[PDB]
Design a protein around this nucleic acid. Structure first.
Length: 224
RNA sequence: AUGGUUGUCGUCAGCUCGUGUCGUGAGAUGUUGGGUUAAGUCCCGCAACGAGCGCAACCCUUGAUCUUAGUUGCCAGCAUU
């Protein structure tokens, strides 16, 4: 149930270069972009609300996938205060597709985290805690958010239809569900729940990650 | 026919694999791009993530001292040739 007047601050994206696939829902082109179709964004937002809620209540983690600059606040704050464990940094190569070696990276994050209070310092010299503290300092800042997915990512809320293209291929690898807000200059048939709206406005990112993350959040704690 | 052993290419810095992806395939990707180093050394981007031998360091010697300890070694500080 998208805020229809509140949706009037997140309709707009690239234009003059829009493919034929993700342009069927286009309203019209008035001199700067194609105006995205509003009512399609509303009804699709309802499909993400009901399907994201009811499918999110089956118990599986939601992958708050985000790439772009200023797309990490909506996914880190949205999922990090939501219930999913996503990755808003530069994308790891083959995130779900590796599924074990990313786990062993979770092992280096595990001994790096638990080695902080594990007497990791004060055993070896200053090069040990210095180089190793650089190791978790340059490991946790890249691949820490996967700790909220010990099983496979049951769904991929990807927030970047172009920058996250290797992610869309990764979820294309398994039969996993990958719904996401893909821009006007994107490919339509690659995703299963199209959020046909822009992503340029950061307030559009807060409305997208807030509707998604709040959808899975409010739909999930209602068991008691 | 060989085991064992040893030269050089050369202390030059390379040489590979597990997993994943691409490509019908052989293959590739990592190992390429950006700098920086003696170094595939280090860092950062990167469809890759990791590890193995290599590099390095660890070993010995070399110039600085401390502490232990002074005999055949050293002789300041005294007599002695």
């Amino acid at each position: 149930m998208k805020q229809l007047l509140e949706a009037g601050v997140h309709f707009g994206h690239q234009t003059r270069r829009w493919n034929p696939k993700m342009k069927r829902y286009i309203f019209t082109e008035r001199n700067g972009i194609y105006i995205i179709d509003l009512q399609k964004t509303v009804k699709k937002v309802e499909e993400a609300y009901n399907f994201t809620k009811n499918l999110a209540a089956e118990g599986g983690k939601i992958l708050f996938v985000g790439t772009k600059k200023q797309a990490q606040d909506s996914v880190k704050e949205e999922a990090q205060r939501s219930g999913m464990y996503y990755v808003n940094q530069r994308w790891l190569g083959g995130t779900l597709t590796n599924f074990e070696t990313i786990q062993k990276r979770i092992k280096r994050l595990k001994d790096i985290e638990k080695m902080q209070e594990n007497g990791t310092f004060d055993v070896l010299p200053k090069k040990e805690v210095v180089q190793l503290k650089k190791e978790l300092e340059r490991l946790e800042k890249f691949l820490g958010g996967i700790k909220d997915m010990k099983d496979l990512p049951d769904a991929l809320f990807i927030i970047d239809p172009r920058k996250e293209r290797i992610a869309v291929a990764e979820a294309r690898k398994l039969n996993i569900p990958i719904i996401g807000i893909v821009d006007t200059n994107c490919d339509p048939d690659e995703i299963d729940v199209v959020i046909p709206a822009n992503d340029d406005a950061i307030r559009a990112v807060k409305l997208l990650t807030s509707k998604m993350a709040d959808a899975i959040l409010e739909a999930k704690q209602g068991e008691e």
